[PDB]
Amino acid sequence: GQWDRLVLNTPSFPSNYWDKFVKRKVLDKHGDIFGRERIAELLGMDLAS
Amino acid sequence: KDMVVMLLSLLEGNVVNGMIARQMVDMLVESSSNVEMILKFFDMFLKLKDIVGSEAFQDYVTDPRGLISKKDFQKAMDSQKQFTGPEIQFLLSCSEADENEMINFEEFANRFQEPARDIGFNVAVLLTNLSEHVPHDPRLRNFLELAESILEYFRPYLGRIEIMGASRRIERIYFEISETNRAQWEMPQVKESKRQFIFDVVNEGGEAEKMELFVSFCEDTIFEMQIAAQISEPFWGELEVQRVKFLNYLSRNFYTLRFLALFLAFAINFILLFYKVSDSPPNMVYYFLEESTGYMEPALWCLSLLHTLVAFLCIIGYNCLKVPLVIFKREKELARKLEFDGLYITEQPGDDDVKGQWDRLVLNTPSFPSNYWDKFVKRKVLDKHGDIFGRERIAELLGMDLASLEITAHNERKPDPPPGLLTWLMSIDVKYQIWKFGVIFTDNSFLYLGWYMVMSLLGHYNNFFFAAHLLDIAMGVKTLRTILSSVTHNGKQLVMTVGLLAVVVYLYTVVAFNFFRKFYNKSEDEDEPDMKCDDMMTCYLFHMYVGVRAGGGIGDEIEDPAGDEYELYRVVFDITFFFFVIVILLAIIQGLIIDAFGELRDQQEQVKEDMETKCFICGIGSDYFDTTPHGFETHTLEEHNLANYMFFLMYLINKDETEHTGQESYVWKMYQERCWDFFPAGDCFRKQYEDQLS
Amino acid sequence: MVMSLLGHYNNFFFAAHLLDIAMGVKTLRTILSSVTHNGKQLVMTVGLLAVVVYLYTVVAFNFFRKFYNKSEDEDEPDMKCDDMMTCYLFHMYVGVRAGGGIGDEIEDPAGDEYELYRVVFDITFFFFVIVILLAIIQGLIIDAFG
Amino acid sequence: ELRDQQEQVKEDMETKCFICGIGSDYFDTTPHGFETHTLEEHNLANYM
Ligand SMILES: Nc1ncnc2c1ncn2[C@@H]1O[C@H](COP(=O)(O)OP(=O)(O)OP(=O)(O)O)[C@@H](O)[C@H]1O
Ligand SMILES: Nc1ncnc2c1ncn2[C@@H]1O[C@H](COP(=O)(O)OP(=O)(O)OP(=O)(O)O)[C@@H](O)[C@H]1O
Ligand SMILES: CCCn1c(=O)[nH]c(=O)c2[nH]cnc21
Ligand SMILES: [Ca+2]
Ligand SMILES: [Zn+2]
Ligand SMILES: [Zn+2]
């Protein structure tokens, strides 16, 4: 669990796993309570893009 | 809350799809709007409590003093998106904003929580009861959906059980569980005790006394919970408070002290490996350390002192932590025997029961119910058995003052003995203390720790006695306990096998002493002969010592019989010795150990299978429940969880009798009478309402 | 791969790759799994064996030193239990490997004031160490099979 | 073999009635049903 923190911010995270949209799904699920910008920083996401 | 209690009382003894429940649902439907308003009140404030702790809110709150402006609060609410605009306006109105429009969100959140918890819990109980007794009603499912947050919040605190009620019908009971009770239950020691109790009742437990054993386990667990609470941390009085602090610290850190003692013993023996013996100092030999550093002797001295100190502290920690449960259990069983069995009134122990004979001392003692709660057991016994066996006689047996019994009832008297050393000495009850000391010295763990302490003290006299404390690794490690238990399991059989081995060797020795003496010379020098079988005792010692240890038997040691008139007799002798003694008897030992392994394994496997296949309470199999998906899991977690029965017992004990409901009073009276018929056996709510539920 | 590369430096490192037969053969994996199943228990049993041998070594170092001379030449004596470390090594090395225990290796106590003490010492060593603890190992393996 | 013989005897006696052969489950449908059956209803000592 500590090691897996590195790959969260990586663009290539869902490289072998099919779901490429899991980051946006998590942002939708937990953005309101935990902050959209904060989730984006955690997951390497560019809110504008 | 009172009105909801009245409604729940109306629902007492309510069958599935009952008229009263359906009319309650109709009333709720008629009052739907106001019910929704109430649920919205509760959910708004519950959600606010978590939102204000949410960090996102902390992002919006910039002000150092912890206050949040009305505008920033509104922005945070809309960001969370869980609230509507009207709800945010209502929250702002309820906020006690100062003239600067600044709000203290902490107090705003904490204000309505505590007042509304009881009503929230009772509303959840009402809705749960109604849902379970009217399973198919969209009008009720809508209310439940509105109350989802409340039910989620109160889920850990809602305990449900099933009993056989006065109506010959299974009834579900809903009650409240305290967070402290749940935490104390979840403590690891309680879990280990639960595992041990389950293993015992499943491997060597009778179904008839299963519920009595379960109730006793619950009582003991409550007592341990009290002990844990007491020891838990948040000029004679000053000395007393530091003393209790020190004792509580020892009790809390008892196991760490045990591990520390083990580590110290290991270090001491590591050092002891370095001794050497020489005639000269560094006719009578000298034992001296050998080290280049030279710092090792004082280290050993210190380690010995610390080990002894830790042993003494472990004694104290045991006496403070675990002895009280021993005394509580012993007092409880004696009280129950007196009240119900009438042991010392009618039956009288057999004189084969040393414990029953020992317990006579404490009957007449004032301090008898010192650790056990019931202080009135003596008067109860006097009422029960006085007429047949004599009130004065019972009073003499139990140390009771018939006159003072009446005065205690007439009014309270205060004979204030201001605290003093002499007053404490008077308070000491010699007979009770002696009985208690006998109990403790009989306790095995106390004996082991005392042996530990004595061996450390002797180690100070001779440092090599510190090696015995390395045997504590057994008790330290569960794996070692299991391995040793494998041997102990068939230990009596092993001793009998050894005795048989001795007997067979004795017979072989007789045969040798009579017919085969010449072959037992163990001397090469012909002038001086050393005959081991010229005497029977020497021959027996020789056989038992060399032959058993040998792989081929005695024939390996004794002289070749080739070219002798008794050659065939001796080869039979030796081969039979080899086969019977070396092969079989040893093989018997190894097979006993192997069988012990399998027996322990199958015990654990059987316990696990019984717990996974059947309910501990009702005994109904997993198949019936699994007819419904996850049915057995739901049954063992919700319907018939034993933890919930324990929590119910605690809840009844804490609750006032006048507040008791009909179900609670029924179960309480049956518990006091020690009747366990209310426990559902062979029946369940599902089975009873099978057709109505579906 | 590393063992092969080291094998190029010294060809004898290629023997380690014969341990791959385990993973190659399912039967070998099952047999080895029988041991691994109770491996922790086996290690604990070995530790207990070491502890008991240590206790016996203490007893010998205190009371039975004279019996631990392993030299026939009287002029030069080789005493294995004049030091505790040497005595422990001697016990763990010879006694366990022996079938009758340490008594097989050390000198006959006949005609000595401590004869009965030593026969108890040797017989108890034999029964507790050689018979039981080993038997515990074999029973653990047997139980793993079942 | 001897161990499993004893265990099987004990399990058979605890699960089924010596007389009727009906299992403990049917009787335990009623609380303490098997105990009542083996002590009162179908006690072999009473037949003797
Ligand atoms: N009446 C019952 N109440 C509770 N559990 C029951 C009951 N009847 C059977 N069980 C079985 O007991 C199991 C309880 O879990 P278990 O004994 O594994 O302990 P635990 O509290 O979950 O934790 P741990 O495994 O750490 O000890 C349930 O999953 C179920 O299999
Ligand atoms: N028809 C039956 N009659 C009596 N016992 C039966 C019958 N069917 C099964 N049993 C089982 O036999 C048990 C009888 O008890 P058990 O065999 O342990 O001997 P006991 O007379 O109680 O005494 P002890 O254990 O000292 O021999 C009953 O508890 C029940 O488990
Ligand atoms: C551990 C003792 C707790 N307890 C109990 O187990 N049963 C009771 O009837 C009672 N009355 C007050 N305390 C009680
Ligand atoms: Ca009342
Ligand atoms: Zn059940
Ligand atoms: Zn029958």
Coordinates of C-alpha atoms in Angstrom, one line a residue, chain B residues 266 268-270 272-277 285 287 290 462 464 467-468 470-471 473-474 477-480 482-484 486-487 494 498 501 530 532 541 544-546 548-550 586 589-590 593-594 597-598 601, chain C residues 40-42 44-45 47-48 51-52 54-55 58 61-63 65 81-86 88 99-104 108-110 115-116 118-119 122-123 126-127 131-132 135-136 138-140 142-143 146:
Chain B
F266 CA 18.6 -15.3 27.3
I268 CA 22.4 -14.0 31.0
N269 CA 22.9 -17.4 29.6
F270 CA 24.6 -16.1 26.5
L272 CA 27.3 -17.7 31.0
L273 CA 28.5 -19.5 27.9
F274 CA 31.8 -17.8 28.4
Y275 CA 32.8 -19.3 31.8
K276 CA 35.8 -21.5 32.1
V277 CA 37.2 -23.5 34.9
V285 CA 38.7 -25.1 40.9
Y287 CA 35.0 -20.6 37.6
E290 CA 36.8 -15.1 29.7
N462 CA 24.8 -19.5 41.8
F464 CA 23.8 -21.1 36.6
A467 CA 19.2 -21.3 32.8
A468 CA 15.9 -22.7 34.1
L470 CA 14.8 -20.5 29.5
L471 CA 12.0 -23.0 29.9
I473 CA 10.0 -20.0 26.1
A474 CA 7.3 -22.7 26.1
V477 CA 5.4 -19.2 22.3
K478 CA 2.1 -20.8 21.4
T479 CA 3.8 -23.1 18.9
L480 CA 5.9 -24.6 21.7
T482 CA 1.2 -27.0 21.1
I483 CA 4.2 -29.2 20.5
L484 CA 4.6 -29.9 24.2
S486 CA 1.3 -33.2 21.8
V487 CA 3.5 -35.1 24.3
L494 CA 3.9 -42.9 27.7
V498 CA 8.1 -46.9 30.0
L501 CA 9.8 -51.5 29.0
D530 CA 34.3 -57.0 35.4
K532 CA 28.0 -56.9 35.0
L541 CA 21.1 -51.4 35.5
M544 CA 18.4 -50.6 31.0
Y545 CA 21.4 -48.4 30.5
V546 CA 23.3 -49.8 27.5
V548 CA 18.0 -49.6 25.3
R549 CA 20.5 -46.9 24.2
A550 CA 22.0 -49.3 21.7
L586 CA 10.0 -46.9 20.9
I589 CA 6.2 -43.7 21.8
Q590 CA 6.5 -42.2 18.3
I593 CA 3.1 -38.5 19.6
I594 CA 2.0 -38.8 16.0
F597 CA -0.7 -34.4 16.6
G598 CA -3.7 -35.7 14.6
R601 CA -5.5 -31.1 14.5
Chain C
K40 CA 7.9 -22.9 11.8
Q41 CA 7.0 -25.7 14.2
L42 CA 10.1 -27.6 13.1
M44 CA 10.8 -24.1 17.2
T45 CA 11.4 -27.8 18.0
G47 CA 15.3 -24.4 19.3
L48 CA 13.8 -26.4 22.1
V51 CA 17.8 -25.3 24.9
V52 CA 17.6 -28.8 26.4
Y54 CA 22.2 -26.3 26.8
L55 CA 20.7 -27.3 30.2
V58 CA 25.3 -26.7 32.2
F61 CA 30.1 -28.4 33.1
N62 CA 29.1 -28.2 36.8
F63 CA 29.1 -31.9 37.9
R65 CA 33.6 -32.4 33.8
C81 CA 33.7 -29.6 28.8
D82 CA 36.3 -27.4 30.6
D83 CA 34.6 -24.5 28.8
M84 CA 30.9 -24.0 28.4
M85 CA 31.0 -23.1 24.7
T86 CA 33.1 -26.1 23.9
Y88 CA 27.8 -27.0 24.2
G99 CA 22.0 -43.1 18.7
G100 CA 22.5 -43.7 22.4
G101 CA 23.3 -40.1 23.1
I102 CA 26.3 -38.4 24.8
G103 CA 26.8 -41.4 27.1
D104 CA 28.0 -43.4 24.1
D108 CA 32.1 -45.1 31.5
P109 CA 31.1 -43.9 35.0
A110 CA 31.4 -47.4 36.5
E115 CA 27.4 -43.2 38.7
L116 CA 23.7 -43.1 39.3
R118 CA 25.2 -39.8 35.3
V119 CA 23.1 -42.8 34.2
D122 CA 22.4 -40.1 29.9
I123 CA 19.1 -42.0 29.9
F126 CA 18.5 -40.2 25.2
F127 CA 14.8 -40.3 25.8
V131 CA 13.6 -40.3 20.9
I132 CA 11.0 -37.6 21.5
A135 CA 9.9 -38.3 16.8
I136 CA 8.2 -34.9 16.9
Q138 CA 8.8 -37.2 12.0
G139 CA 5.3 -36.8 13.3
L140 CA 5.1 -33.3 12.0
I142 CA 3.6 -37.4 8.8
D143 CA 0.8 -35.0 9.9
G146 CA -2.3 -36.4 6.0

